[PDB]
Amino acid sequence: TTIQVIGAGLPRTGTNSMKKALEIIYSKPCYHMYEIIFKKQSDISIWQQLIDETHKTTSDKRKIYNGLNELLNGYIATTDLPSCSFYKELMTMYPNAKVLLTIRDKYDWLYSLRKVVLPKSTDPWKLKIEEGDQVLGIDSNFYKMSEDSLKFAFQKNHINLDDDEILLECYDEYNRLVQEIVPPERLLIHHLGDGWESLCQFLNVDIPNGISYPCANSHHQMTQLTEQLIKHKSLDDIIHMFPGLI
């Protein structure tokens, strides 16, 4: 199995629902950050090595392709960070693969990112995220990898991640750049809420007859998951409160 769909959309743009939609369409796994967090934490250090290679002035792209092939063996599609930041390298590796860009209102995106992924350094909620992550075995190596992959997506060496203007500017620029670099015939821009119609047409499949388009991974659910992880101290003992999570 090889990559058929490359998801270029940023975190908090509907990537987990798209992951679930592609798994329905193809009956084969799709990569997502939640594969790392909940299934393959050993992938963190491999992604870090790939991201480190992007920091060099002249990255060895073939070293990156090699690592990507290893990470993505067995998967038919990618979404979310860290893979989205590698969409150009994936397009070269898989020239027949189609590219998705999931997108949403930038201000809704920023809030979602701040509540789930990248709280500001002085937000007390950041401590709750850290505590709940500790329950999952997630440590500082994960945060470094996630942040470095977002900076690679935004093509920045340093950025003050607490600066909302920079994040909004980079979101807009990233989404613009995808449309500048990917030929339109190979790109579907999927707006949050769009559903099956445009995706199935783009992928040359019928709409799945009696299956609703997924609506997964809301910030409310992620906040509740963090709170329950902290209180109950176990994923397995609370997972049933979050049906369809992983």
Ligand SMILES: Nc1ncnc2c1ncn2[C@@H]1O[C@H](COP(=O)(O)O)[C@@H](OP(=O)(O)O)[C@H]1O
């Ligand atoms: N079918 C759908 N329709 C509307 N919003 C959806 C959706 N599927 C996911 N979302 C929203 O997409 C965001 C998650 O994206 P990702 O999976 O990339 O992290 C969440 O936004 P909120 O945080 O505003 O709730 C989620 O509610």
Ligand SMILES: CC(C)NC[C@@H]1CCc2cc(CO)c([N+](=O)[O-])cc2N1
């Ligand atoms: C489970 C919860 C208590 N903490 C883990 C959360 C899960 C959601 C999440 C999603 C992304 C992008 O999908 C990233 N990310 O890009 O770093 C980090 C996190 N962190």
Ligand SMILES: [Ca+2]
């Ligand atoms: Ca480089």
Ligand SMILES: [Ca+2]
């Ligand atoms: Ca500016």
Ligand SMILES: [Ca+2]
């Ligand atoms: Ca629709």
